[model samples]
Target: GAMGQKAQQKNGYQEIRVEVMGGYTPELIVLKKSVPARIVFDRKDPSPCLDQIVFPDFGVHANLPMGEEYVVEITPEQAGEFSFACGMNMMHGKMIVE
Candidate 1:
């Protein structure tokens, strides 16, 4: 279940802000060092567009409701790269955990 309010601090990972317009704000988000990576979907469009977006590793299929934000938490077990994008395939972003 999702937390009602944002967590002031988390133990395992850091927070990374993911935007539909600019992609991952910082680009590289180190895991373990970064806990609860906040995947914010702030798109001012329709819902069907989001249906195509995919977070393969996380099993997060798109079709996310419009005007709503989804927060995804990923814990990096090892050093590597992870990528994510929008349903339209218009936006692309990634994070590296080391």
Candidate 2:
């Protein structure tokens, strides 16, 4: 639970990019305060177990395809931790806004 990755500073925003392997990836992400975080899912799996992502905290729910990356952006007012999951809710990940 303590292991995580932080979004790197971009010229215009921050990026939290991750690769989706079978049954996993960098399950945690950190975002800096007051910046746009453009998250990318380097989706490499075509399996049904991890085909999509759901961000309950952000009210964003969407499905994903295989081999290609998918992108989403989020800008929160306060710094906190949010949780996301697969389309089936069987798998999950975390996002920390700090």
Worst 10 residues of 1 by lDDT: 1-10
Residues 17-72, candidate 2: write the lDDT tens digits.
77787755767888888888887888887877777777888888777668788888
Using all chains and alpha carbons, the TM-scores for the candidates as numbered come to: 0.55, 0.87
- For model 1, residues 1-98, the per-residue Cα lDDT tens digits are 42122223445445544444334344444454334555555554554444445775566665455566566655555566766666544665565555
Residue 42 of model 2 has an lDDT of 80
**Candidate 2 has which clashing residue pairs, if any?**
none
Best by TM-score: 2
Off by over 4 Å in 2: none
Candidate 1 whole-model C-alpha lDDT, 0 to 1: 0.51
- lDDT winner: 2
